[PDB]
């Protein structure tokens, strides 16, 4: 494992409500956003291009095309800022990291559903 | 890991030659640094032999050199076959520590620390 002390101290931080997902899956991430005083949930929907790290330090990256511009949001898996994650679709991919998608668009960028 | 004053390909090749030689003879005289590296390589080969499965044999075949050992019976056995037969059988009940190094002292030519690495 990691150092036992590191695991013991950060065990409370981990969230157990999160669903299981893999790179290539389409996720609807419900993010808590504060605009001025007001607080609202804004949904970022995209393909997961990367998952890395372990424990409290684990992160995942979701990619979406907005108005012809690719946008990537990287999130700590156990951040309290994410209200919820929903797996809209499961994608067939042949590798852990989908960096090749960054230079692809349209039909070339399509990922087949499992 | 030790570089052994060789490039990656040369290092890997020499380690294969050393491991096979140790498997064949069961004892070899070499330099201390080479012996310290080879002990890891050989013991991992013994581990594969003890598992005994085809996948392990194929994984061992990647490292072992293709050599022929002539037995007293006059039967010919490959190094891979000796590893997966007699050597694996010997160390079934032993967990690790299949090799030992004995220091012999410096050699005349370059003052290199000569050592004997042997199975057991």
């Amino acid at each position: 494992t990691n150092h036992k002390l590191i695991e013991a101290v950060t065990k409370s931080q981990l969230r157990t409500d999160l669903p299981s997902f893999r790179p290539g899956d389409t996720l609807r991430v419900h993010v808590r956003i504060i605009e001025g005083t007001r607080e609202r949930i804004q949904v970022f929907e995209g393909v997961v291009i990367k998952r890395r790290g372990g424990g409290v330090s684990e992160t995942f990256t979701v990619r979406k095309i907005s108005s012809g511009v690719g946008v990537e949001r990287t999130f700590p898996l156990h951040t309290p800022k994410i209200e919820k994650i929903e797996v809209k679709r499961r994608g067939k991919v042949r590798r852990a990291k989908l960096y090749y998608l960054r230079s692809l668009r349209g039909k070339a960028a399509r990922i087949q559903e499992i | 890991y030790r570089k052994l004053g060789r490039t990656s390909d040369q290092r890997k090749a020499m380690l294969r030659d050393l491991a096979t030689s140790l498997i064949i003879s069961e004892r070899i005289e070499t330099t201390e640094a080479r012996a310290k590296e080879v002990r890891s390589v050989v013991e991992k080969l013994i581990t594969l032999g003890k598992k005994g499965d085809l996948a392990s044999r194929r994984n061992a075949a990647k490292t072992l050199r293709n050599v022929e050992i002539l037995n007293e019976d006059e039967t010919t056995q490959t190094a891979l076959q000796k590893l997966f037969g007699e050597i694996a059988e010997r160390y079934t009940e032993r967990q690790g520590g299949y090799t030992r190094i004995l220091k012999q002292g410096p050699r005349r030519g370059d003052g290199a620390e000569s050592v004997i690495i042997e199975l057991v």
């Binding site: 804004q42 511009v69 946008v71 990537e72 990287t74 999130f75 951040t79 | -």
Partner: protein, 122 residues
């Protein structure tokens, strides 16, 4: 990470298509600018009949970058391109339309009109 000589697309209908960064404002020896930072730029390519012309020295605010930004919660946003919006001294956009997504950090900078105009603020 936008520096001197960095070329940025222009995310507006001001008439400028591509600008080149003359300067990163905000202190002596300041090397790089990211989203929300104001830069001085020259217009290299302009759409014909636009208000802003080629070779005009103008001020712009950075709205998207490939480098992206890190938020306090440890989350990150990165864009496929580096884009800026030509701005007036008041911080209002020279053009009437904003094109493409913009980072929320513009709200912190008080570029409210741009944030309002932008199709998506992320």
């Amino acid at each position: 990470m936008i520096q001197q000589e960095t070329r940025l697309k222009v995310a507006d209908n001001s008439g400028a298509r591509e600008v080149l960064t003359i300067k990163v404002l905000g202190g002596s020896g300041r090397k790089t600018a990211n989203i929300g930072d104001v830069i001085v730029c020259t217009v290299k390519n302009a759409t014909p009949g636009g208000v802003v012309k080629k070779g005009d020295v103008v001020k712009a605010v950075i709205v998207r970058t490939k480098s992206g930004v890190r938020r306090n919660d440890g989350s990150y946003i990165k864009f496929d391109e580096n884009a800026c919006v030509i701005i007036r001294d008041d911080k209002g956009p020279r053009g009437t339309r904003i094109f493409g997504p913009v980072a929320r950090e513009l709200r912190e900078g008080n570029f409210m009109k741009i944030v309002s105009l932008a199709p998506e603020v992320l």
